[PDB]
């Protein structure tokens, strides 16, 4: 995903010089849910991965065939909702949240805590 806050100003094909010389023959790890701003073509270009099929701990190489997508769309509402909640976003009720964690400790990461 290109974003018009960054990439807008340079055009061409969607696998052009703006991402070539740092991911030349790459096989570098991209991840769905990761957005990284790389300067290319004298302009900063962000790169958000939104869809990947083959085992999403995935690898792409722009010297191979790319299914390049070229829609610059803002996700500033999604940027403000990227975190959108957290334990750091909850304060003053640490005992209640600790009790809630003790209650929901079984469905996540310890389902076999029934013996």
């Amino acid at each position: 995903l290109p974003i018009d806050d960054t990439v807008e100003g340079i055009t061409g094909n969607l696998f052009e010089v703006y991402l070539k010389p740092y991911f030349l023959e790459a096989y570098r790890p991209i991840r769905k849910g990761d957005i990284f701003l790389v300067h290319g073509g004298m302009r900063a270009v962000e790169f958000k991965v939104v869809e990947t099929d083959p085992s999403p701990y995935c690898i792409v190489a722009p010297d191979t065939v790319i299914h390049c997508e070229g829609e610059p769309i803002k996700r500033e509402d999604e940027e403000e909702s990227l975190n959108e909640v957290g334990y750091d976003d909850i304060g003053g009720c640490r005992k209640q949240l600790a009790q809630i964690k003790e209650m929901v400790e079984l469905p996540l990461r310890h389902p076999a805590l029934f013996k």
């Binding site: 023959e25 790459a26 096989y27 010297d63």
Partner: protein, 104 residues
């Protein structure tokens, strides 16, 4: 290219590549992982002191398709090329590093 070797022949090729590289016990052993061009496959078999041409011979013994196709190795973001295959690992920064292979 993809893995041109047979999966039944992959074990024999890796055993021949391990037997082609001598193993030393009285030296500080390093291990070099090479990011292959067939999908990013990784192999962990190296000795203490060798050369870049020894890495090329290990790649040739690992996969028979790499003998017929020339490749130039690279590393992750110095934007340089790994030429001079007879050089050692001391001046080439190949001490548990990442080697990326591109077919010419």
């Amino acid at each position: 290219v993809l893995n041109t070797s047979s999966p039944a022949q992959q074990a024999e090729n890796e055993a021949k590549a391990s037997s082609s590289i001598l193993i030393n016990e009285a030296e500080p052993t390093t291990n070099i992982q090479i990011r292959l061009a067939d999908g990013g496959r990784l192999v962990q078999k190296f000795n203490h002191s060798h050369r870049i041409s020894d890495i090329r011979l290990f790649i040739v013994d690992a996969r028979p398709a790499m003998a017929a196709t020339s490749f130039v190795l690279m590393t992750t973001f110095p934007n340089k090329e790994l030429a001079d295959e007879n050089q050692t690992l001391k001046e080439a920064n190949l001490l548990n590093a990442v080697i990326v292979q591109r077919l010419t």
